[PDB]
Design an enzyme around this catalytic site. Structure first.
Site, PDB file in Angstrom:
ATOM      1  CD  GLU D 235      -2.690  -1.024   2.256  1.00  0.00           C
ATOM      2  OE1 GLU D 235      -3.991  -0.468   2.428  1.00  0.00           O
ATOM      3  OE2 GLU D 235      -2.663  -1.890   3.128  1.00  0.00           O
ATOM      4  CD  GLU D 340      -3.849  -6.819   2.700  1.00  0.00           C
ATOM      5  OE1 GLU D 340      -2.399  -6.640   2.928  1.00  0.00           O
ATOM      6  OE2 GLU D 340      -4.580  -6.051   3.446  1.00  0.00           O
ATOM      7  CB  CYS D 342      -9.897  -8.423   4.329  1.00  0.00           C
ATOM      8  SG  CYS D 342      -9.392  -6.550   4.516  1.00  0.00           S
ATOM      9  CG  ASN D 370     -10.134 -10.395  -8.377  1.00  0.00           C
ATOM     10  OD1 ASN D 370      -8.756  -9.926  -8.190  1.00  0.00           O
ATOM     11  ND2 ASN D 370     -11.048 -10.063  -7.998  1.00  0.00           N
TER      12      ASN D 370
END
Ligand SMILES: O=C(Nc1ccc(Cl)cc1)c1cccc(S(=O)(=O)Nc2ccccc2C(=O)O)c1
Ligand SMILES: O=C(Nc1ccc(Cl)cc1)c1cccc(S(=O)(=O)Nc2ccccc2C(=O)O)c1
Lengths: 497, 497, 497, 497
Positions: D235, D340, D342, D370
C-alpha cells in the site's frame, strides 16, 4: 468590516470565533474597474477571504504557467450554493442567544457573509435528528387524515428558514428530500434497515406516499414557504442494504422509475405545486450512469424528471468522468446537482476537527471537479453541528462548516466555511462555466465562469506546498499576473468590458 | 380485571403489552375481614401484581425469618408517589391514539392502575425536551411583560395533567422545578454550562427570577392548575460544573440560602400563591447534610423552606445514613422528599432494557431505603419514553417505567412500573411508616406502614435468588405464614380490627 | 536545564511538547540554605515547576491567612509515587523513536524529571491491552505446565521496566495486580462478565490460582525483576457485576478473606518470594471499612495482609473520612495505598483533553486529600496513552499524564504530569506527613511533610480563581511569606536546622 | 472424510467447529469416468463442500439458463490461492494445542483441506502485530550489519510456514511485502503517518532499503525458505496520507518507478535471489491504470517488474473493467495478482460475524470477478484471527476465514473459508481460464477453467434467493443438468475425454 478572530485547536489552521457581539463580516460588494482585477485570498496561515486588487497587464513574457480563458466555450449555468437545515442544525442554532443566531445566519445568507441561495430541508426525521418520527405515524392512515408537522418544523426549521430568506439579498431556493416513509407503508415495518414501499407502483401504498409529498408541500405553503425542487428519496440504495442504520426507504432504479411514472410525477403534476422540480437519484455518483439510463429511457418517467441529484461521500470509488461525464453525454438536457456533501471521514480522525485546512481543501477540490463535470449546484449537509458532530440519534457524527459551542454562546467558522464561500459568494445564479486551458502540467485546481453581466470569475486552489507563479490570460482584457501560495485558495474577479 | 400480556425482549423478565384496546388493569379494591390478608405478588418469572388471600392465624407454623409489626413505633407520614410530565413524556403519550393514551393514563393514575398522586412539572425546557426555551426568552424584560407559556405547556403538558386528574383515584399534588432561567439573567448568557444568576440576591436579576416563579404559577392557575410545591432549582450544583450540557442554573448552598431569604421566599409569600410549599436542594443526596446546614441554620431562609428534595441515580452507590439519616437527625422538623429517581445505563448497557427485572428491583430497593430513612414521597423521572430513551436533545441515558412504540400504537409496562406500583397503589397519602422488627439476619428488604384507617401494609422485596420462608406477626391479629420467592416483590395488606 | 515548549489544543492550559531531540527537564537538585525557602510553581497561565527562592522572615504581622506547621504531630510515612506499565503504555512508548523513548522515561524516572519510584505491573491482560490472554490459557492445566510470559511482558513491559530502573536514582518498587485468571478456573468460563473462581478456598482451583502468583514472580525474577508487593486481585467487586465488560475475577470480602487465609498467604509465605507484601481490596474506597473488617478480623488472613489498596474512580460517592479515616482508626497498623487513579471522566468530555488544567487539579486535590487520610503511596494508571486514550480493546478510553503522538514522533506532557510531579519529585520514600493548621477559612488545599533528614516540604493547591496571600509559620525557622495565585500549585521546601 | 459440526452464532449461516480431536475434512480426490461429473455444494442452509455425482448426457432436458463451455477461448493461467501469515495469524494458530494446530494447517494446506499454495509473509511488523518493529531498528546502520529476524519470525512465522509446506498437497509459493522501513530512513522518522524514504532514488537511503530486501531474503534462505515473489511496498499510497495509523512507507507512482529502476531492481538482480519476481503497486485497484502507466512506460523500471499486485476491500464497490480490464488492455504482458483481500466491517457490523453467509459470498464474487478480468492469483489477508478480529495494535476492522477461540482449544471455519475453498481446492497452479457463454440474462456468477490435464472446472455462485435451474454444456461431452439453489455455491468438475 470585521476581521477573523483566530483560534487554534491544534490542527493545521485556525477557526474564526464568533459570539453574540462579534463575527467576521464583509463590506458591501465592490467592483474592480476595467483594467483591474479583484483577488480574495484564504490561506492555511490564517488569511480569510482577504481582498486585494491588481492591474491587468497588456503583455506577458515567460515560460511560467499560463491559464487561458476560453470565453466562447460555454457549459452549464449555475443554480446556486447552500446547505441543509436539519433538525440538528436548527436545534444548535436556536440554542445560541438571539444576537449570536443572527450573526450565524448572516454569515451564510447575507451579502455581509457568503451569500447562500439554496436550503435543503429533510421531510421529517433523518440521522441528524434526536428522535425518529414521520409526518403520518398513525398506522394505516392511507387518507393521511393525521398528517401534521411537528415542532421540529414549526418551531425550529421553518422559523429559521424565514429568517434566512429575510437576510438574503439573493432569491433563495428550497429543496426537500425524504429519508423514510411512515413504517406502515414499508415491507419491513421500521424506519431503518432493509425495506421498500409495500406493493407495486400505482397501488395504494405508492399513491399514499406520493400524496404525502403533496401534503408536505401544502403544509409548508401554509407557512408561506415554497419549494424550488424535491428529490424522489434520499439515498434510495441505502434501504436495499441489510441492517442500514439510519432512516431510509429502498428503491431499485426500476422501482424509482415506476414510482415516478405512475405515482409521484402525476400526483405532483395534478397538484397546485406542479411547478416544483423533481430530482432523481439523490445518491452516490457510482450509481451513474445506470440509474439515469433506467429512469430516463422510460418517457413516462423522463417527462417528470428535471435533474439528477448526487452525493459526494463515496466519490473516491468511481471516477467523475465515468459517472457524471457519461451521464451528461447520455442525457445532456437533464441537469446534475450535488444535493449532499460532507467530511467527517477518515477512521483515524475525529468527526469534528476544529481548524482543519485539509477538510476545507476537500470541499473546494470537490466543488471544482463537480463544476468541470457539468454540476449546476451544491448543497452542503448540516449547516451547523456541535463540537461532537451532533446531535445524531445513531451517533453518525460528521463535520460541519460552522460548529456551535452552546455553553460558551460561541460558534466557530471552519476552513470549510471559507472554502465554500470562495464559490458561493462570487458565483451568483445564472453564472455559466466557461473554458480554461493550462499551458503546462500543474498542481492547481481551477475553474472559470462568466457572470450574467459578462464579468469573469476564476477560482484557483493550490493542492501543493509550493508557491506557484501564475498568469491568467483573458484575450478581452489582457494578462492577470499573480502567485498562488501553497495551500491557498483564491477567487479572482474582473470586468471584461 | 385484565391480566398482563407478556413479551420478552431478551432481558431477564417480560414487559406487559398494551395498545389501543387492551391494557392490564385492576378491579376496584376489596377489603377482606379481620383474620384474612391480601397479597399482591410480582416475580421475575412473570407474575404481575397478582392478588391472593390467606389467613392470619393464632399459631405460628414457620421456623425461619419472623418480621414483627411494631405499630406503636411511629415515623413519617407519606405525601405520595408519582412521576414527571416532561416534554418527552407528554410527546410520547400523545403519539398514541386517544384510546391508548387513556389506558396509559389510567395505568398510572386510576384505581384501575397504580394510583399515582404526584406529578412533577418542569418549568420550561430541560434535557427531556426537543428544543431549548424558557418562558421569557425576549431579553431585558425585567418586569416579565412578555412571559408566556409555549405549546409544550398549553398543548402537551397541561391537557395531559387535566386528564390525569380527571382519572385520578386520589387528590393529585403538582410539584414544579426550573432547569434554567432566561439566559439574559445568567453570568454566562447560555442555557447550560457553568453559570449562575447575575449580581447578588436582592438585586434586579434575582428579583426578576423570583417573579418568574409567580408568573409561572399565575399562568398555570389560569389553566385551573394549582401547585402543592416548587423546588428552588433543579440540581443547583450542576450549574457549578464547567461544560455541564443540560439546561441548568448554578447555586452554591450560600447562594441558594440568600436567594431564598431575600427574593424567592418573600416574593412567594407576598403572592396569591403563598400556600405553595418551597423545597430546597433538589439534588443528589451527596450534598447532605452540608447543604441543609448552610440553608437551614439561617432563620431568614429557614422560615420559607418546607422540605428538602433529593435526587437518586439508582445505578450508583452512596451512604443513606450519612446523608438522609444525619440530615433527619440535625433537622428533624424538615421533611425529606425524593423529587427525581431514575435508572441510568451503566456504560455497557442500553438506556432502555425492555423487561429488565434488575432495574425494577433497583426502584423498590430505593423506595424501601428512602422510607426507612424518613423520606415522605418518591417521584420518578419521565413518565414515558420511546424505545431509545428519548426524546432528549442532549443524550439518552435513562430508562422509564413505560416505553411507547409509536409505530405500533402500543406501550410496554416495564418491571419498574410494577415495582413502583407495589408502593404507590397501596400507600395512600397520610399513611404512616411504623416499626417492623426482623428476628434474624436476612436478605429481604421490608417496610411496614399504617393506612389512615389503621390497616397494615407491608412490602417485601427478595433481592436473592433463593425462596425465603417468612412469617409476619401482627401482635393484634396473629401470624401470616408465607414464602418470598427469589427475586420477587410482595405487598401484604390486612385489617387490624 | 530545558524549559517547556507550550502548545494549546484549545483547552484551559498548555501541554509541554517533547520529541526525539527535545524535552523539558530539571537541573540536578539544589538546596536552599537555612533562612531561605525554595518554591516550585505551576500555573494555568503556563508556568511549569518554575524555581524561585525567598527569605524566611523572623516576624509576621497581619490578619492574613497563616498556615502553621505542627512538626511534632506525626502521621504516616510515605512509600512513593508512580504509575502503571500497562500493555497500552508500553506499546505507545516503544512506538516512539529510541531517543524520544529515553526522554519520556527520564521525564518520569530521572532526577531530571519527576522521580517516580513505583511501577504497577498487570499480571497478564486488562482493558488497556490489545488482546485478551492470561499466562496459562491451556484448558485445565492445573499443574501450570504451560505457564509462560508472552511478548507483552518479554518485549514490551520488562525491557521498559529495566530501563526505568536504570534511569532512576531512587530505588523503585514494583507492584503487581491480576485482572482475570485463566477462564478454566472461573465459574463463567470467560475473561469478563460476572464470575469467580470455581469451588471453594483451599481446593484445587484456589491452590492453582495461588500458585499462578508464584509462577509470575518466578518468571519475572528470571528476568532479574523483584516485586515489592502484589495485590490480591484488581477490583474484586467488578467480577460480581452482571455484564462487567473488562477482564475481572469476582470476590466477595469473605471469599477474599478465605482465599488469602487458605491459599494465597501460605503459598506466597512458603515460596522464595515470601518477602513480597500482600495488599488487599485494590478497589473503590466505598467498600471500606467493611471489606477491611471482614478480612482483617480473621487472624489467619490478617497475618498475611500488609496493606489495603484503593482506587480513586468512585471517590465522589463516599466521604474519605468514613472510608479511609475509619479504616485507619480500626486498623491503624495496616497501611493504606492508592493503587489506581484516573480522569478520563465526565460524559460530556473527551477521554483525552490536551492541556486540561482542571484534570491536573483533580490529581493534586486527590493526592492531598489522600495524604490527609493516612495514604502512604499513589500509583497513577496508564503511564502513557495515545490521543484517543488507548489502545484499549473495549474502548474504555481515559486520560494519561503523557500522551504519545506516534505519527509525529512526539509526546505531550499534560498538566496532570506536573501536578503529580509537585509531589513525586519532592516527597522521597520515608517522608512523614506532619500537622499543618490554618488560621481561617480558606479555599486552599495544603499538606505538610518532613523529609527523613528533617527538612520540610509543603504543597499548596489554590482551588479558587483568586490570588491568596499566605504565610507559613515554622516555629523552627520563622515565617514564609508568599502568594498562592488562583489556580496554581506550589511546592515549598526549606531546611529546619 | 469427516463432516462439518455446525454451530450458529445468530448470523445467517453456521460455522464448522474444530478442536484438538475433530475437524471436517476431505477424502483424497477421485476422478470419475467420462460421462460423469462431480459437484461440490455449499449452502446457506448449512451444506459444506458436499460431494455428489451425476451424468453428462447427450440430451438436454432443461429449458432455463444454459452455460456453454468454449474451451478454445483461452485466457490467463492461474498461479494459485492462499493467505497471509501475519504475526496475528501465527499467534492465534500457536495458541491452540499442537493437535488442533495441525488440523487447522491441514484445513488450509492439505489435500484433506482446501489446497492453498500461496503464503504472503509481511517483512517485519504491520497492524496485525502486537508491537512495532523492523529488522534494523538500530539507527544509522546503512550497511545493515545489525539486521536480524526477531521471535515473530524465528519462533512463530517460520516454523508454521515449514509445517504448512510439509503438509501441502502442492508446491507452495511464498510472497513477501514490507509495511515500513526502519524509521531512520524515513522523512518523518516514524513507523506510520505521511512519510517516504529520505533523499532520492539512487542515494544512500534508497540503496540501504533495497539491500534490506536482500537481507530479508538472505535471512529466510538461512531458514531454508525461498520466495517466489516480493512486492515493492504494501500500500505505497497509504504513506502519502496525513495521520495514516498503520505502519506504512509512502511512494508516489513516480517515486516507486524510480526506486524500482535505480535501487530495488538492480540490487535484487545482482543478488543470489535474482529469480525472485517483483510485483508493483500492491494497493487498491482504484490506482490503476495510472500507476501502471507511470511505472511500466519507463523501460528501466519495466524490465524489473513481473506483475501488478492489487488489494480488495470487499465491502466497497469500484469499477473492475475500468481498472483491471483497462490495465490488461494497456499492458497485456504484465500479470495481475490479488495480493490482499478482506471483508471489512461496515460501521454498523462487528469485525467478526461468526457464520456470515454474506461475507462468504463477497469472497466468491470477488474471486470470480478477478478471474474474469485476467487476475492470476488471489491471496487472503490474515489466515486466522481471534473472535474480536485481533490481535491488532491499532484497530480491529476485518474478518478472517478461521476464527480461533483459545480459551476452548477450538477454531471455527467461517463460510468465507468454504467459498475460498470452492476455488483453491479445485484450481491447481497452471489451470487456464477458458470461455463460458451464458445463453440469457441471469443472476449467477460463473467461471470456467481447464486443469493442466485438460479436465474442466466450473464454479457457480447464486447471489439470489431463488433456485435457478441450470444446464451446463461441454461441446465435447454433452449436457449437465443441475439446479443452483438460492445463495449457494457449486464447483463442478469433469473429464473431457
Ligand atoms: O429489625 C429492625 N428493622 C428491620 C431490619 C431488617 C429488615 Cl429486612 C426490616 C426491618 C428493627 C430493629 C430494632 C427496632 C426496630 S423498630 O421497629 O422498633 N423501629 C425503629 C426503632 C428505633 C429506631 C428506628 C427504628 C426504625 O424502624 O427505623 C426495627
Ligand atoms: O456470456 C459470456 N460470459 C458470461 C456471462 C455471464 C456469466 Cl454468469 C458467465 C459468463 C460470454 C459472452 C461472449 C463470449 C464469451 S467467450 O466465452 O467467448 N469469452 C470471451 C470472449 C471474448 C472476450 C472475452 C471473453 C471472456 O470470456 O472474458 C462469453
Amino acid at each position: 468590516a470585521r476581521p477573523c478572530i483566530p483560534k487554534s485547536f491544534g490542527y493545521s489552521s485556525v477557526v474564526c470565533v464568533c459570539n453574540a457581539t462579534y463575527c467576521d463580516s464583509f463590506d458591501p460588494p465592490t467592483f474592480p474597474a476595467l483594467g483591474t482585477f479583484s483577488r480574495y485570498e484564504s490561506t492555511r496561515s490564517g488569511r480569510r477571504m482577504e481582498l486585494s486588487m491588481g492591474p491587468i497587464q497588456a503583455n506577458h513574457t515567460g515560460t511560467g504557467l499560463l491559464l487561458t480563458l476560453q470565453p466562447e466555450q460555454k457549459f452549464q449555468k449555475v443554480k446556486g450554493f447552500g446547505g441543509a437545515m436539519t433538525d440538528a442544525a436548527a436545534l444548535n442554532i436556536l440554542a445560541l442567544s438571539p444576537p449570536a443566531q443572527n450573526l450565524l445566519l448572516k454569515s451564510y445568507f447575507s451579502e455581509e457573509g457568503i451569500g447562500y441561495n439554496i436550503i435543503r430541508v429533510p421531510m421529517a426525521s433523518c440521522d441528524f435528528s434526536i428522535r425518529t418520527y414521520t409526518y403520518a405515524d398513525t398506522p394505516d392512515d392511507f387518507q393521511l387524515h393525521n398528517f401534521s408537522l411537528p415542532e421540529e418544523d414549526t418551531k425550529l426549521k421553518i422559523p429559521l428558514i424565514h429568517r434566512a430568506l429575510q437576510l438574503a439579498q439573493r432569491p433563495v431556493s428550497l429543496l426537500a428530500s425524504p429519508w423514510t416513509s411512515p413504517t406502515w407503508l414499508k415491507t419491513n415495518g421500521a424506519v431503518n434497515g432493509k425495506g421498500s414501499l409495500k406493493g407495486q407502483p400505482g397501488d395504494i401504498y405508492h399513491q399514499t406516499w406520493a400524496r404525502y409529498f403533496v401534503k408536505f408541500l401544502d403544509a409548508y405553503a401554509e407557512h408561506k414557504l415554497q419549494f424550488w425542487a424535491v428529490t424522489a428519496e434520499n439515498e434510495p440504495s441505502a434501504g436495499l442494504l441489510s441492517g442500514y442504520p439510519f432512516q431510509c426507504l429502498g428503491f431499485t432504479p426500476e422501482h424509482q422509475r415506476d414510482f415516478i411514472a405512475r405515482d409521484l410525477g402525476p400526483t405532483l403534476a395534478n397538484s397546485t405545486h406542479h411547478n416544483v422540480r423533481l430530482l432523481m437519484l439523490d445518491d452516490q455518483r457510482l450509481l451513474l450512469p445506470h440509474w439515469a439510463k433506467v429512469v430516463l429511457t422510460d418517457p413516462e418517467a423522463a417527462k417528470y424528471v428535471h435533474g439528477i441529484a448526487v452525493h459526494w461521500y463515496l466519490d473516491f470509488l468511481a471516477p467523475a468522468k465515468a459517472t457524471l461525464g457519461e451521464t451528461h453525454r447520455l442525457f445532456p438536457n437533464t441537469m446534475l446537482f450535488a444535493s449532499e456533501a460532507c467530511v467527517g471521514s477518515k477512521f483515524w480522525e475525529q468527526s469534528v476537527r476544529l481548524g482543519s485546512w485539509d477538510r476545507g481543501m476537500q470541499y473546494s477540490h470537490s466543488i471544482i471537479t463537480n463544476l468541470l463535470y457539468h454540476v449546476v449546484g451544491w448543497t452542503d449537509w448540516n449547516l451547523a453541528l456541535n463540537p461532537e458532530g451532533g446531535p445524531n440519534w445513531v451517533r453518525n457524527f460528521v463535520d460541519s462548516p460552522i460548529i456551535v459551542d452552546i455553553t460558551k454562546d460561541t460558534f466557530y467558522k471552519q476552513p470549510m466555511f471559507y472554502h465554500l464561500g470562495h464559490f458561493s459568494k462570487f458565483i451568483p445564479e445564472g453564472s455559466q462555466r466557461v473554458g480554461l486551458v493550462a499551458s503546462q502540467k500543474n498542481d492547481l485546481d481551477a475553474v472559470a465562469l462568466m457572470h450574467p453581466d459578462g464579468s469573469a470569475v476564476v477560482v484557483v486552489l493550490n493542492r501543493s506546498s509550493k508557491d506557484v507563479p501564475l498568469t491568467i490570460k483573458d484575450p478581452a482584457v489582457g494578462f492577470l499576473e499573480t502567485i498562488s501560495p501553497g495551500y491557498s485558495i483564491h477567487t479572482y474577479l474582473w470586468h471584461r468590458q
